[PDB]
């Protein structure tokens, strides 16, 4: 590892969790500013908001899973910073 | 074909119509366009502009 990598992993872990959880919030409230981030198609306007709401759930889960990877990076880095 | 902004007897509009003698008449053809041989249909062919 080395302490350089562990320190980078701490900074990345903090930043990743902060941004991805905040995105999780905006996706769960169906915020309009996030529309460009949602990976929909021209057919997803059919009937009403049902498809875009399902995609809002998927991108919320994407960010939640990615935040989980940053939590794992964090727990690793908080050990390695003491071990190197 | 041919196109011109002002086929006219007035100097303010180019003086393209010329009288060598005194005249009681004046004329102006703003955006004059004409075509008079090898026409096809009612549509003008590409125009050479006077300018």
């Amino acid at each position: 590892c080395g302490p350089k990598l562990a320190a980078c992993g701490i900074v990345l872990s903090a930043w990743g969790v902060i941004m991805l959880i905040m995105l999780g919030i905006f996706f769960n409230v169906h915020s309009a500013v996030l529309i460009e981030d949602v990976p929909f198609t021209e057919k997803d306007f059919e009937n009403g908001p049902q498809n875009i709401y399902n995609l809002y759930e998927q991108v919320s889960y994407n960010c939640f899973i990615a935040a989980g990877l940053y939590l794992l990076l964090g727990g690793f880095s908080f050990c390695q910073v003491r071990l190197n | 074909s041919f196109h011109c902004e002002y086929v006219s007897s007035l100097s303010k509009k180019g003086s393209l119509l010329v009288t060598n003698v005194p005249s009681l008449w004046q004329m102006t053809l703003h955006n004059f366009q004409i075509q008079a041989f090898n026409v096809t249909g009612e549509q003008f062919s590409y125009a050479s502009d006077c300018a």
């Binding site: - | 074909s1 180019g14 549509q43 502009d49 300018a51």
Partner: protein
């Protein structure tokens, strides 16, 4: 246009063009020449260029 009418290019157009072409070529040469002269100006740091 359905009749294929001409692009209505004005009279004075040779004059507009020879104003804008030669004014812009004069301005563009004045910029280019000046820009070349300042870009290749001697920066004059003789006190350190040799040490």
């Amino acid at each position: 246009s359905p009749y294929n009418l001409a692009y209505k290019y004005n009279l004075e157009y040779s004059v507009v063009f020879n104003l804008v072409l030669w004014i812009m070529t004069g301005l563009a040469l004045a910029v280019i020449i000046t820009s070349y002269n300042i870009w290749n100006m001697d920066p004059g740091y003789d006190s350190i260029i040799y040490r």
